[PDB]
């Protein structure tokens, strides 16, 4: 019964990754004024299976790793984190209801970078090293800021439960009480994934994803997996945190529907932002975070420490 629950959670996020990649290719296609894949199956529904079994079957391809340990560690870690992140996300019901919750997601999201340190470490290519160190740097710098945001927007919940969030949302979406901090936290969600503008790239550039996206073949179908699945997550955790629907018990699938729709549309907006804008150069990015985001986050935060005591509504910890 319980392993049934686990399987029903984790298999559909993988299928969700495949057909997500489909929707990505299409939305970018028409956004670019051209039809996406039609010629694999009808309408493009066989495209993932192509990508899937082929991209699995192309042979391992290079080089001496120098560490047999890490090379087969990092993918397992990246997946395992990407799969367990989905546990607390509320849904009508969490599948594990944790008192703390959201800071558990915050915590594992903080662990997610060892796959980049180790992945980029075992290349034996001294350039992919440097690239990896840098990607760790930007991911980590946006692990600073984001944490403070959750530590603010949550302060209108009154507890970490991640369930009571759906209780706060009943009257008004949390986007209204703070829009700006929600804006900064959206862009923050673009950060770690390194969607455009924040992505690094091919041609001439730091090429972190040059060997990172190149190397490890099938295990690149893994890093591929954890990256897209992690995307769908951060979209969902946005949908839960900064907005949400009314939960009518006796009919949970109603809230499940509405939740699903808004989340999917949000991810759609990721893929079309990536279409939309150019990339920042690296330093302008890092100290764009240090220049402006983090100070204004501090301001809004202290204003949310002082605010609820002003208006005399401070939230009811259960």
């Amino acid at each position: 019964m319980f392993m049934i629950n686990v399987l029903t959670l984790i298999i559909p996020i993988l299928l969700a990754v495949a057909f997500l990649t489909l929707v990505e290719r299409k939305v970018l296609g028409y956004m670019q004024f051209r039809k996406g894949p039609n010629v694999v199956g009808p309408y493009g529904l066989l495209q993932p299976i192509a990508d899937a079994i082929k991209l699995f079957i192309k042979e391992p391809l290079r080089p001496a790793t120098s560490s047999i340990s890490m090379f087969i560690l990092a993918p397992i870690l990246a997946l395992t984190l990407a799969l367990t992140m989905w546990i607390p996300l509320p849904m009508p019901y969490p599948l594990i209801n944790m008192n703390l919750g959201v800071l558990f997601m915050l915590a594992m999201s903080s662990l997610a970078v060892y796959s980049i340190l180790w992945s980029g470490w075992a290349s034996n290519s001294k350039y992919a090293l440097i690239g990896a160190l840098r990607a760790v740097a930007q991911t980590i710098s946006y692990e600073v800021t984001l944490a403070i945001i959750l530590l603010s927007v949550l302060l209108m919940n009154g507890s970490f439960t991640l369930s009571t969030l759906i209780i706060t949302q009943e009257q008004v979406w949390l986007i209204f009480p703070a829009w700006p901090l929600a804006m900064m936290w959206f862009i923050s969600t673009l950060a770690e994934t390194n969607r455009a503008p924040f992505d690094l790239t091919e041609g001439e550039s730091e090429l972190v994803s040059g060997f990172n996206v190149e190397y490890a073949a099938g295990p690149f179908a893994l890093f591929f997996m954890a990256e897209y699945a992690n995307i769908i997550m951060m979209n969902i955790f946005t949908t839960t945190l900064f907005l949400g629907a009314f939960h009518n018990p006796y009919m949970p699938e109603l809230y499940t529907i509405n939740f699903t729709i808004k989340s999917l549309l949000l991810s759609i907006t990721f893929l079309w932002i990536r279409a939309s804008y150019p990339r920042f150069r690296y330093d302008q990015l890092m100290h764009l975070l240090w220049k402006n985001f983090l100070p204004l986050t501090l301001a809004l935060c202290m204003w949310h420490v002082s605010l609820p005591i002003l208006l005399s509504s401070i939230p009811p910890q259960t």
Binding site: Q32, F33, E202, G203, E204, E206, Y277, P278, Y282
Partner: protein, 387 residues
């Protein structure tokens, strides 16, 4: 010790041509860059010496492939100039028309691919659709897609198919709308701007010593043009105005390319209004072949045909340097003719071969991630640079 030596990369997804590069740098900053050019070098100038003028012309097509009818115009103007001929007026007008059309091509490419390199996957797509419409024009005109000559000495041959200028008009109608759509796609984008603002500036006199000729001099002070100052054909007459910029900032150069696209629309328009119905080729039978109706049934037309193909017209000896305005800047060929059929020694001038030599100074003040934009910003094709 410190520093480094890094290298190029084989392609970005749109890459036109490959360079290597060696940049001695400091921590995420480039102190010295030394581009290795000559990677793709096909040895044209040695080939041209072995082939007659009519034969060597596709070389002048495809040495710089993006802008094409322009290079055609350069070599043709060279042979005409040295050969004491004038093309009939309608030839000059058609040549102007497709000249500025081609300029619209090379500019829209340079801008869009400059975006795709930097980010911004989409504008490449939106605009290269219209570019496909442009080649849809060429295919009617010359009977092939891209490299088809459709330019000779002593004027163009095979005038437009009946009903072409309608299509030309129709594209030129709303191209303005679409390029403005690009201007909303960019230009006040905090990303693209804030990536390229002060990167790779140039002092005017410095640009003169380094010999930059093109959107470089345009966008940085030093108001100059060959189109205005040394009109090489009826392109003199039509009215239009060139842009400039005062920041020398590499952003000015962008906007100058844009405004040159718009002005190109003006020139195309007025050209469509002014077109005389004179004729195509010159009337001198020994410079350019006769049409088949005269070829057959008439003796001298046949002879001049046969020999003008086998041996080709003979060009009197002389040394010429012609220069035109090509969308990458001043382009020119230096012809050296023994009195003969074949040429002898002709060295083209690639604007990219000059502009590229400037990365040493231009890139001295910005780290490599924007050395990308430093290379891409000045319109350059490594097929033209090498030669």
């Amino acid at each position: 010790v410190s520093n480094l030596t890094l290298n190029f990369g084989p392609q970005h997804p749109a890459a036109h041509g490959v360079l290597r590069l060696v940049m001695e740098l400091s921590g995420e900053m480039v102190r010295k860059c030394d581009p290795h050019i000559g990677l793709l070098h096909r040895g044209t100038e040695k080939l041209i010496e072995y082939k007659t003028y009519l034969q060597a012309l596709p070389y002048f097509d495809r040495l710089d492939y993006v802008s094409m009818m322009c290079n055609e115009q350069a070599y043709s103007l060279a042979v005409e100039k040295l050969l004491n001929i004038q093309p009939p007026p309608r030839a000059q007008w058609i040549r102007v028309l497709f000249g500025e059309i081609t300029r619209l091509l090379n500019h829209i490419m340079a801008v869009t691919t400059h975006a795709l390199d930097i980010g911004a996957m989409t504008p490449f797509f939106w605009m290269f659709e219209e570019r496909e419409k442009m080649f849809e024009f060429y295919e009617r005109v010359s009977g092939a897609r891209m490299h088809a000559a459709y330019v000779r000495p002593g004027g163009v041959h095979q005038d437009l198919p009946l009903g072409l200028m309608d299509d030309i008009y129709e594209f030129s109608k709303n191209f303005s709308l679409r390029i403005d759509e690009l201007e909303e796609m960019l230009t006040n984008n905090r990303i693209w701007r804030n990536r390229t603002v002060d990167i790779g500036v140039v002092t005017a006199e410095d640009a003169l010593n380094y010999g930059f000729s093109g959107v470089m001099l345009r966008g940085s002070g030093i108001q100059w043009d060959l189109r205005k100052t040394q009109p090489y054909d009826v392109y003199d007459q039509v009215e239009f105005d060139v842009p400039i910029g005062s920041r020398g900032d590499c952003y000015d150069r962008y906007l100058c390319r844009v405004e040159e696209m718009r002005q190109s629309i003006r020139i195309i328009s007025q050209c469509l209004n002014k077109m005389p119905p004179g004729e195509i080729k010159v009337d001198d039978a020994k410079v350019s072949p006769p049409k088949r109706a005269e070829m057959k049934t008439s003796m001298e037309s046949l002879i001049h045909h046969f020999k003008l193909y086998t041996e080709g017209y003979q060009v009197p000896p002389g040394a010429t340097y012609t220069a035109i305005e090509a969308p990458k800047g001043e382009f020119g060929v230096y012809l050296v003719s023994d009195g003969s059929s074949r040429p002898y020694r002709c060295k083209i001038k690639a604007p990219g071969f000059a502009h590229l030599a400037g990365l040493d100074k231009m890139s001295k003040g910005h780290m490599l991630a924007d050395v990308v934009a430093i290379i891409g910003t000045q319109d350059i094709v490594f097929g033209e640079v090498d030669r």
